[PDB]
Design a protein around this ligand. Structure first.
Ligand SMILES: Nc1ncnc2c1ncn2[C@@H]1O[C@H](COP(=O)(O)OP(=O)(O)OP(=O)(O)O)[C@@H](O)[C@H]1O
Ligand SMILES: Nc1ncnc2c1ncn2[C@@H]1O[C@H](COP(=O)(O)OP(=O)(O)OP(=O)(O)O)[C@@H](O)[C@H]1O
Ligand SMILES: Nc1ncnc2c1ncn2[C@@H]1O[C@H](COP(=O)(O)OP(=O)(O)O)[C@@H](O)[C@H]1O
Ligand SMILES: Nc1ncnc2c1ncn2[C@@H]1O[C@H](COP(=O)(O)OP(=O)(O)O)[C@@H](O)[C@H]1O
Lengths: 712, 551
């Protein structure tokens, strides 16, 4: 327990830390020597220790300025070590901050030199911030540089240099060179995988040598654009603390031939010099696109040079390469072979919790009004990647500015600060901004998590048990299958009337095994067949493999029954290894046009008929829909359920929606001429009078005959 | 050895040593004994003992060309042979030379050739020769026409009488300009296919020679379960297993004591296999099958006919030469689906100890539509290269234009009769088959495959259930008797359903070994929940077609 708890300090001394004698006793520290306190994100400082019997054992006294410099908060744990190599400073260069000297001119360096460094011997280190009082101001300066290294102490004979110009304060904050794990949310799994793939090769290279293996080098993270790939890479690099080096695809590809090779070679050589190091790339597809479409010689030479540099990498060297690409298959396949980028990571759109975390992170500096319900925004915002959330916050702030603008006059060059103090973003502003958003990730196949349970499924208990036995057991109990030798089936196909709850069944199955659902509608297959769509089925299955376990869903699978797409699907499904936790669920209302090859063994062989909901199922479905709309007390739904023979889930939902619309219209009329914020009997009466069925009886008979034929 | 405990290490019998990954002799390669022997014969003798060729008076061959699936150790094999023979190894990459400027590539090539010549006990190993010299009908650019021309001039201008051997590697055989295949150039072709069980076990032993393997290792089981894995895939599997072991041990985390506890277990290998994904099955590749004649049940007359067709011509070529009958090569199996036609083909291939080649209907369609990595030309060229080989064409009826049929006819007729390459076609729709393929000198022999009888069904059931537990005293004769009119697929489905029921019951019992085997009642329920998959109409049609052929 050398770690000590961070404690708030009333005193403003920037180099004095007061601790009890037992604090020294724990580490056997001796009075009269400074101590090194190290926090987080490679942040450390040196403080002169004083004995304060008042403080209880383990209690420290550090001003807020030092904690702010260390990038730490109260109540944290910081490692304390002695200072055996105490050294004095011979030449220290320090420059001021212009915004800190506002209101008073002149050179305060001479004013502060003697009084502040009168044999004080205050320990100093690179990047520290120290505050000194001059006249009526308390001006803070930064430790630009110190010699001899590394930290040293400010001796009286030390020569202090001030030849230079001030620098901005927020510039360092916006440099983006300091971003920890705290600046990311919703990516616990991917972040953990990247940490496991990066920290161990660099932090603990001895493990691989002990076990006798060459550590991996090629990590490739791909996902939808604007999902935070660059931010995650920067965060992991800074958290590791190793030397960093970035290469931009657009930058490298923008220079005339030959210069690109020099840039790449210099980057690799320089990174090797500073081992351990990490090399990052952006839009690797841009510099090494799909060779099948671009035959230019420049890209060929660039990609060949990159491959040569990768392959020639020495066996033992703490260097890890990271690449980013939107389309996993866009890059030239030669990069995916062994000894190169092989550790593939897929980043999907965050779920509700991830969106809430991202919104929390971004909304850390805006003047949020008192009435903010970020939970509601997280629940409502579906399909928003982080970039869209940042844009949403910016737009809401802009709307607030619009509303508040009328008070001020924009012609004048100065705006009163009293109005500025009144700036505040209300929930209505966020509502409007969400109204004026434009999500795009959902338009392409992207893996997303689902949280649908069996409860939402209104009945079909036997189908539930059959599907459980088919899917859950091989995913959680492969040992029994291995013992018996039976391989697990993967191909399951639902057939039945439309709107009978097939998508919900697939989502529930995916949720049960805690897998990443993937959806692919029939129009997507058609567009892929025509080639207009970007992603191909190969890409879909590659993403599914990389994100395993996953459940792929092919809706309206008959829409392609076209033959090229069917053949490609057959080939890819055959190539899939059974032992992998990949499952495919097909849906179609016409189980006759599907090619027989689709039903062959090792493919979509399992067939499940989905019948129309029963009366109990109808009642359960009605209860499920009626969860947020208030209902008249004493209302009875049994009459509706019994009078709705042959209905489907979509029909019942439509009935509920039209009844709600009638109730809302009645409320609008009453208000214009909300005492009745719920639905009453008359609305349901009208809805049932306007009731119908989505499926004719002839189709039901056809489905029954087909099911009996399949059974026989 | 190699022109070289302390003394043994010195004679090979700080990073600068290990990073210098050389001296990789024949020990560090497995599963390629035939190809290793061919390359050794074509390399060592020209270099070590050129005097023999002078004594017999004939120019030793020089042009060698290897092709096979990517990541099969071609470069490693070339490096190993170069180190073993002790000669200087020069390496060239096709894209690399293509990467440089228009005139720079020709410079590089000529300077490399001359430097080798001045110092020429050596092997000038080109790589990806297809990239520099692609098919002429595809690309006809200035640089394309220039670099290939320079390479052709250099090859033709080989000084001869020297100790220079040129080796080129390409994933696909017919992906290069044909100009390189003439005499005086790359002519000695070598094919490398996916290793068999013994090769995979050898590779596993080679790689897992430093990893701290746990006590429980059954590498034989790993080899048996891992199918279609190239050496690169095996290396990746080992690395993934080690990574999984590290992850598992990381929960407790450095003290040396924990380092002492590192050990790779069978669970790690199983997990790595789960995470692995071979990339070789998608391409047509040559392998060796070991299906025995006793493995299948019944069809004794069919076995006799196939023996007469294939075994005797190859086992006793002298008899056929004396009698003058050229070996028959056109065999077409027809019958109800799921009758084990592929199993019979594999048995036939195993009989002559030839390499079996499989091409499925989806591959035929992919070639038909033009979207496909390989064409029939490549399939037959590889079949010739890896001779003897048995090619299997599954679902010939699925090519229902006629471009593919014409190409197949041309390839079948062109190949010389003497070469030991046999073609076996399978199809359940003989009527749809183009009549042109049934002509003499082509797929002329027809073999009907009748459904298995009670004895055959019992044999199938016994064979399938050998590797799974069974209830002692179970009598399968009744099961076979009560399964008339079924096929192999139906029996396999019944077995799978019974195993599924057993698994479900075992899981429920464990939740509540209670049942480590399948009981008679489980099979009874499985059969009662399953029925025949072939209607009587199809069997009647097959019988009518058989009668028509007989008449
Ligand atoms: N946890 C987070 N996850 C995703 N995006 C985030 C997160 N935190 C912040 N963001 C926002 O995401 C964007 C940062 O990611 P960036 O735009 O670089 O992603 P990218 O599309 O992968 O980038 P690149 O241009 O390198 O391909 C910024 O808008 C940042 O505000
Ligand atoms: N007998 C073997 N067969 C196949 N691979 C092997 C064998 N022994 C080792 N390997 C491993 O398989 C890979 C074979 O070498 P390499 O990666 O150069 O493949 P390659 O097919 O020769 O390459 P390329 O075609 O790009 O020149 C290496 O990982 C090597 O360690
Ligand atoms: N068990 C169920 N059967 C049918 N519909 C259900 C069931 N449970 C819920 N529903 C509701 O029925 C509708 C089904 O829509 P959807 O999943 O698109 O159906 P489909 O896949 O048949 O087109 C949704 O409103 C869903 O919430
Ligand atoms: N003697 C046999 N007769 C018929 N089928 C068999 C025999 N032995 C094994 N089988 C089974 O036949 C199956 C081959 O199925 P399939 O490929 O559909 O047949 P084909 O290739 O002849 O159409 C294998 O899974 C195997 O288990």
């Amino acid at each position: 327990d050398n770690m000590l708890l961070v404690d708030d300090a009333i005193n403003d001394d920037n180099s004095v830390i007061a601790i009890n004698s037992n604090t020294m006793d724990k580490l056997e520290l001796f009075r009269g020597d400074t101590v090194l306190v190290k926090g987080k994100k490679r942040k450390d400082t040196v403080l002169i220790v004083l004995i304060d019997d008042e403080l209880e054992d383990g209690a420290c006294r550090i001003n807020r300025v030092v904690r702010n410099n260390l990038r730490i908060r109260l109540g944290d744990l910081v490692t304390i070590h002695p200072c055996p190599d105490i050294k004095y400073a011979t030449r220290i260069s320090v420059l001021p901050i212009a915004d800190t000297i506002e209101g008073i001119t002149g050179n305060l360096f001479d004013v502060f030199l003697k009084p502040y460094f009168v044999e004080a011997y205050r320990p100093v280190r690179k990047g520290d911030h120290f505050v000194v009082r001059g006249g009526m101001r308390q001006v803070e300066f930064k430790v630009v540089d110190v010699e001899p290294e590394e930290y040293a102490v400010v001796a009286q004979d030390t020569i202090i240099h001030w030849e230079g110009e001030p620098i901005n304060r927020e510039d360092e904050e916006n440099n983006m060179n300091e971003v920890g794990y705290d600046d990311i949310g919703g990516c616990r799994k991917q972040m953990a995988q990247i940490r496991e793939m990066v920290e161990l090769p660099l932090r603990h290279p001895q493990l691989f040598k002990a076990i006798g293996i060459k550590p991996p080098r090629g990590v490739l993270m791909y996902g939808p654009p604007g999902t935070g790939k660059t931010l995650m890479a920067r965060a992991v690099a800074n958290e590791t603390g190793a030397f960093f080096f970035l290469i931009n695809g657009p930058e490298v590809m923008s220079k005339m031939a030959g210069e690109s090779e020099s840039n790449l070679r210099k980057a690799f050589e320089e990174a090797e010099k500073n081992a351990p190091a990490i090399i990052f790339i952006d839009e690797i597809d841009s510099i090494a696109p799909k060779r099948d479409k671009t035959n230019g010689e420049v890209e060929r030479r660039v990609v060949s040079q990159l491959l040569t540099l990768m392959d020639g990498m020495k066996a033992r060297s703490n260097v890890v390469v990271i690449a980013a690409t939107n389309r996993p298959n866009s890059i030239d396949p030669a990069l995916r072979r062994f000894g190169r980028f092989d550790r593939e990571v897929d980043i999907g759109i965050p779920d509700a919790t991830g969106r809430l975390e991202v919104l929390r992170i971004h909304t850390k500096n805006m003047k949020l009004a008192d009435d903010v319900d970020l939970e509601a925004l997280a629940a409502e915002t579906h399909g928003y990647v982080g970039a869209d959330i940042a844009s949403l916050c910016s737009e809401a702030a802009m709307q607030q500015i619009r509303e508040k603008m009328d008070l001020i006059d924009l012609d004048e060059d100065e705006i009163d600060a009293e109005v500025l103090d009144s700036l505040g973003v209300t929930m209505d502003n966020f509502r409007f901004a969400l109204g004026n958003s434009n999500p795009s990730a959902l338009r392409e196949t992207v893996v997303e998590s689902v949280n649908v349970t069996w409860d939402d499924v209104g009945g079909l208990d036997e189908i539930k048990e059959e599907l459980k036995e088919t899917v859950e057991y091989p995913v959680l109990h492969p040992d029994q299958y291995t013992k018996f030798g039976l391989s697990p089936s993967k191909g399951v196909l639902f057939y039945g009337p439309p709107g009978t709850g097939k998508t919900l069944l697939a989502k529930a199955v995916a949720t049960e095994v805690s897998a990443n659902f993937i959806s692919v509608k029939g129009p997507e297959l058609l567009s892929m067949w025509y080639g207009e769509s970007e992603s191909n089925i190969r890409d879909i299955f590659d993403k599914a493999r990389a994100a395993a376990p996953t459940v792929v869903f092919l809706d309206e699978l008959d829409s392609i029954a076209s033959d090229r797409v069917v053949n490609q699907l057959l080939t890819e499904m055959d190539g899939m290894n059974a032992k992998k936790n990949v499952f495919v669920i097909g849906a179609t209302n016409r189980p006759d046009q599907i090619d027989p090859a689709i039903l062959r063994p090792g493919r979509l062989d399992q067939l499940i008929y989905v019948p129309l909901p029963d009366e109990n199922a109808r009642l359960s479905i009605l209860n499920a829909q009626l969860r947020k709309t208030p209902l008249e007390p004493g209302l009875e739904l049994t009459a509706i359920a019994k009078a709705t023979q042959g209905f489907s889930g979509a029909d019942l939902l439509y009935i509920v929606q039209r009844a709600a619309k009638y109730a809302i219209k009645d409320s609008i009329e009453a208000h214009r001429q909300d005492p009745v914020p719920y639905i009453t009997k008359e609305h349901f009466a009208e809805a049932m009078k306007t009731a119908k069925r989505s499926v004719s009886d002839a189709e039901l008979r056809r489905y029954e005959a087909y099911s009996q034929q399949m059974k026989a």
